Amino acid sequence: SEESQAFQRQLTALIGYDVTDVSNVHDDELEFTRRGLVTPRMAEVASRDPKLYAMHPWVTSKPLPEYLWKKIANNCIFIVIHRSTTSQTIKVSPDDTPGAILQSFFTKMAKDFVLRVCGRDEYLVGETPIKNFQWVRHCLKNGEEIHVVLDTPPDPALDEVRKEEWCDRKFRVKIRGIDIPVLPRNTDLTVFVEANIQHGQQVLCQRRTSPKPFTEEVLWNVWLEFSIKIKDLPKGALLNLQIYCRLLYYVNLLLIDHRFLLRRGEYVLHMWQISGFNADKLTSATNPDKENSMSISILLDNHPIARAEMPNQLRKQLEAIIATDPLNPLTAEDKELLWHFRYESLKHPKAYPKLFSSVKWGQQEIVAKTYQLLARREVWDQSALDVGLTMQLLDCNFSDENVRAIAVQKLESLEDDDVLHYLLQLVQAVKFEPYHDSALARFLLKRGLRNKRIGHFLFWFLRSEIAQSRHYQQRFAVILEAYLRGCGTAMLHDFTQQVQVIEMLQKVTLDIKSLSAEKYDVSSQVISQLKQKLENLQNSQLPESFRVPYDPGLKAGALAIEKCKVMASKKKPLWLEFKCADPTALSNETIGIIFKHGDDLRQDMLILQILRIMESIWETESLDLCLLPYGCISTGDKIGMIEIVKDATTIAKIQQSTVGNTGAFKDEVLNHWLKEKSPTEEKFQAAVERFVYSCAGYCVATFVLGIGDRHNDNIMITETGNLFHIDFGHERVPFVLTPDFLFVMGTSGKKTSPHFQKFQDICVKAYLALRHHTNLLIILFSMMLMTGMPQLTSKEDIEYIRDALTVGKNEEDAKKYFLDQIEVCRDKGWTVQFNWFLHLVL
Template identity: 35%
Template sequence: MPPGKYGMQEEWEREGERGIKMDFLLPTGIYLTFPVSHKDTIKSIKTMVWENAREEALFMALGHPDAYVFTCIKQTGEREELEEESRRISDVQPFMGVLRLVAREGDRVEKLNNSQISFLIGKGLHEFDAQKNHEVSEFRTKIRAFCEEKAQLRQASPWQQWMAYMYPCDLEPCCSLPMCGKQKLQMRAFTGKVKPEDYTLQVNGRWEFIYGRHPLCQFKYIFSCLRTGQNPHLTMVHHSTISKYQEEHGRMCSQVCKSRSLSRPPPLPVKKLVVQAGLFHGSELLCKVVTSSEVAVCSEPLWDQKMEFEINVADLPRMSRLCFALYAVFDKAKKPRGTKKKNKKVDCPIAWGNTMVFDYKDQLKTDEVLLSTWPSVPDDKSDLLNPMGTVEKNPNVDSAAGLLIRFPNIRPYPLYYPPLDKVRMIKNAGHSTSSNIKLKEIMDNKNYTECFEDEKELLWKLRTEVRDHYPENLSKLLLITKWNKREDVIQMVSLLRNWPELPAIPALELLDYSFPDPAVRSFTIRCLRKLSDDELLQYLIQLVQVLKYESYLDCDLTTFLLERALFNRRIGHFLFWHLRSEIHVPSVSLRFGLILEAYCRGNIHHIKLLTKQNEAQGKMKVLSDFIKSGSQKVNAEDLKLFIRQESDAFSNLLSPLNPSVILAEICVDKCRFMDSKMKPLWLMYKNPWTQGDMMGIIFKNGDDLRQDMLTLQMIQLMENLWKKEGLDLRMIPYGCLSTGNKMGFIEVVKNSDTIANIQRNNSNSAATAAFNKDALLNWLKSKNPEDKLEQAIEEFTLSCAGSCVATYILGIGDRHNDNIMIRENGQLFHIDFGHFLGNFKRKLGINRERVPFILTYDFVHVIQQGRTNNSEKFERFREYCERAYKILCRNGTLFVNLFAMMKAAGLPELSSFKDIQYLKDSLALGKTEEEALKSFKVKFNEALRESWKTKVNWMMHSLAKDNRP
């Protein structure tokens, strides 16, 4: 029998229903001891305490039970008030089985909400109070008021809008508006009260709810999104007006004083320690990097050195970021392995840290700042500074080096960055017709990052022409703006006021780290308001990641996401889990925790549903950890016994993968753990809507699913783009969601098997299985008798075309026959996306994958229906591939932008612009459609010609798997 998370759980399991004895200390000083069951809730235990206390002295001194709350010391040594009385005692796990009853203080509802939110988001709200940070306090107050206001508006909305919030429609993308009867509605598991007059529709055996009393053909789904209010006006000190600000021509300077607690000394032989500092605006260096003098290595090295930058204070852009790097200098002759050369000496990065030059109230910083730095990770970057990194301080102060920085007071009064409404625009000079022709050539050049200097000068000179005639090229203009020159910044910001709003999808590019200016961010969010709920969900992963680029807690993107989440529960569900899955990351823990708290404040009723999912995940992790520990042999019966005992936690919860689906009763006999390194849990549930049907989820513990999630998101986007142009390639972008540190859920695709299993079951040995070209076709024949076979082959043909194009463009690696699956109806799909963007697996320095994508002769054998001379079917397959590729190339910029927005995620294979170059090449950016198609045809022929290498790779994989102990 697998034990629980703590020792008390083991004791409960030994005692069974008899329970174990627990001690209770009453406010009257009386001790009570009696047995409780692991299924008892805090509320039921409180009732038992009152029943037992009736026979004790001083019972009359006790008040009403609601006036008291249990407190305990947890296994981690923390004290906790158990305000959430519906929790089971086995989930609380008090240390030594002792509960203390104390008088409840303060607002009970508020304390209960705080307790629930802390437990749900995995971060105590007291940690925010302990920050003693004005920015944190003001943000919490403002965003809480905002979210609670939106909650009141939602509550006061008509019931049709409330239904739209609770059960938003999910419509299939198509080339034209579908008839109502063909709409794919996913509003499952409605648990509220429905008026008899409301219409319902049964789809795939489930009752789907339509809001309103209209006939189905007149059904209209209406959803309104409220705009956020204006930012509060910033009061300026009288003598720090714009004119006065523009008179400030003093140099920007700071003083690096010393480094405290250098707990990670560099490897010997170290010569000296050096600090490097640079001023950045996004990725642009505003002036020369400044380097300190060298000091001797010690626990608290002292520099006490003024660092002056070659830029006037008046020229500092609003989002100026001061970046520091601490590194060690070695003698060249004693260079440690893996370090980089720098003239006659070698430098080894130790730590880095960033801070803003202006604070969140627009005031130029003064006084001292203790910068708790982040340890440097050795990589291939040539720069020591990390401007793309966070401006948050490292919360692990005990293990981090601290740099003490002093900003000088250059005036006796505060200096504020002037508000944007005070800047004035300078008119452009005239221009010639030839200039307009040259401008058009620049605008038509997709590879705009390689502009020459004369082109940049012309582009800036004709900036109003760009606004009036080429507004979609705003990013080109922003990239060539001189952000270290105040006059140019004024021109750019002024121009933005009258810039035509861009379509939402192209505007996503402007959320990149390279465009941090507040005016640009505000303009971008205005454009993003055009996104429909479905579109917002499609890009939500990226929008959460670019939150990491924001320099201040209060920003337009945060407000925008919260607003949309509070008016669409599906958006709220996925926003919660995208944030919650990274709450353990120190650099974003504070920001994400505050946003999660704000969402919960604005949606109290959602807390219970999310808590149920969170608790179920906790039980799954306990079980998974025990199975992986190998402390004792776990068989299928042990697994089923644990699940049966915890069936209340596992059952009746909304699926994390799709909040429209209820995971009702868990089918214990169908559950198992899979035979792979991380022992994923395979959990099956009875479908409450269809008799005999089942649905399943896989819980993975130990793997980072974010790369799989991103890849499947891209495949889903590709499918949407194809469908909009009338091409349905029958893709299966199954559900995948990262919900925590290296854990998450994957959707079970029913009635499917791997290519490896199919080949192995139709062959005599693993060595020959990969070369059996009839195995797939015979398997499809066995699953699709007679008239169904032709349709299954068509499904295979379409899905194979989509998979070939998708895996080629995304550069999916590790494509062995255990990572490719097929459904019984013929749909082919890929799984396990641990390598992408051309990062193919290598062994002994040899690339094991030498084809652009997987197109083996057994696939062709199925497409040609088993006839070698059936070239018509194969040519139709080739046409599907080419058409699909052309559609994606026309949308190539979108894919590049979405991947660029994911750089902040910290995925090993996606950390810089170099990693995205593969995507630009595969999408043929900068080439004409004819050139792109010609290049793809070459890759197609190569994949077919070299497919025997794939078969050899599959054979080696099968042999290695069979020889695995």
């Protein structure tokens, strides 16, 4: 058809990659997966409720934390309804449904409709108590009043989805040879090929070639015989082919394909080059740069596939192995114990990761028995979702389809609320699937299509990776295409505007980093063309309005060209401010966006999301630490959108206003600065308060993730007392608790204080609360390192967090350890901060 072509061309542009193009393939797994995804997509599209889909109530089943109940001192919540220029305030109880509210307002004044929040595409509707809406919980936490407009439900027809048209030999590979157009480097060290049979980052078996000269063309013409039988290869096994002299080049080929056939025949595989363990090392994708890249050539000639009583001290040993954290290596002795007593091990949902990584995947009969084992899934199926546990089964240690589906099965009882929390890490976990079609991919697809807020973020998380990693762009592009094919015409339109806006702003942030070298002075000569360039696009190019990618409820309109600037940084970010598109917005404030180029913007995403998780983990134990994890979305290569928090300034800038000299710091400017911004001694008091919580929150959070040692430049504070770290994109100090912080805390040097006793109190409460979730945190950390960073040590980088969380200690030792950290920051005072300036001559 012809309109099926126009729309494909559309999808391509939304995606930033062409899923039909086939220059860089060697089997049809990608196409097959496009076909396979049609079914679950269509099922979820037919299944979802029109009305609730269009309105996407954002809701939770969690209780209201004690610290938000305190703010309804009366069992009544105030809601303010609007006509056009008229308004009225209604008393309501926290167990009231928005249904029970519209009628008690219609009975109120009486001389069909829905309540949507003023200034936003957000809605209070569906059978949920209003205490349970996220907007309502945000308004309470922030002391703001609930503003809502009476209007019509959005026509569900706007989400119209378009109709779619659619034996016993040992294993052996021959290494023919290697080639690369341009070699010239060091000189001539030897070079060899190493072949691994791999399953779940476990090497089943390994053969090398002879060493030989590193010329632009090397040849071996050898059969490498492996020790494994063909019949013993498990589904998901990779042939991992590596070049040394030392690891220089890698590529992978799936030994068994998406059709359960053994891979046979000739290959010429274009390899990836090491930079100078991580998720990139595992990809089945070949390098698409056919011209510059090293290739290897190989031939595959080789086809069907498809209890009693435990003694006492053994149980103790078993149970002691199970109580161990996810990063304690299992001894051979440990593995046999788990395996031989597998059935006793199946009663402990917690044993599952260690049990399934006690399996000899390279023996067919053992795999069989493992599959018979997972048929008895009573205990697993009946245990409560432990997200931590489930993530472990989706990391690089598990390549078995059946082990990974019981993890995914567990994810099914996450409510949208929790999915949104884990959504980025689940997307990144797609990098550990052996095949493009997975239970995990389909979970994401389904949940994305069932809820617009999940859909939206799923679009950007996938597009973020599609634009910046060649290693996985093909896989993620197929998943996104599948998504965009069922999300609906209103969302496609919405997406199209967002992509147009960031693309236009790219041709801008583009030509501007250029105009002043690295000299930090920003000429008005340079803000000349910025303003000119913005005016340009405003007429007949730049969309009327766009959904703010990191805050999808909010609609940005026209630039406020006057307030736009180029920021002072060595990078040259755009400081952009937009008008709100929504005439019902209560405020007149601008939407400020930093548009930033030339940095790993994905690590900032990873870190910020872990922060949000940490807040929720704190929520489950009734704590509020007033983090401010600002919005931040990667749109493409080295480059994206970042939310500007209002009335906020850098600590550094605060230190450079009164005086600003060369490495000099003052203890009282911050405190004084808070007073000058506080119009009442009251509001001043509320500030010192927020500072104590926010300061402690960042100290703990940041200690734990090992990102605590920051320069002043990258710590901010709001006029209203909220501290917050920025720019996580990659003597020492565990965190930033400097004398200027301590002076706000009404303390100095040796002595104590009321606010400082509190600050220590809150740190300890918060720390030991994360230690209750030790395992979840280690798995997120570990996963972040593998799918997020440069190079990292499978036992060194990752183990930082175990020591940071002080694994294996009683609550008392741990409190001590953390309180010692506070003392370390005290001793060093201004030292490290000063060092930065010192070194700018080293």
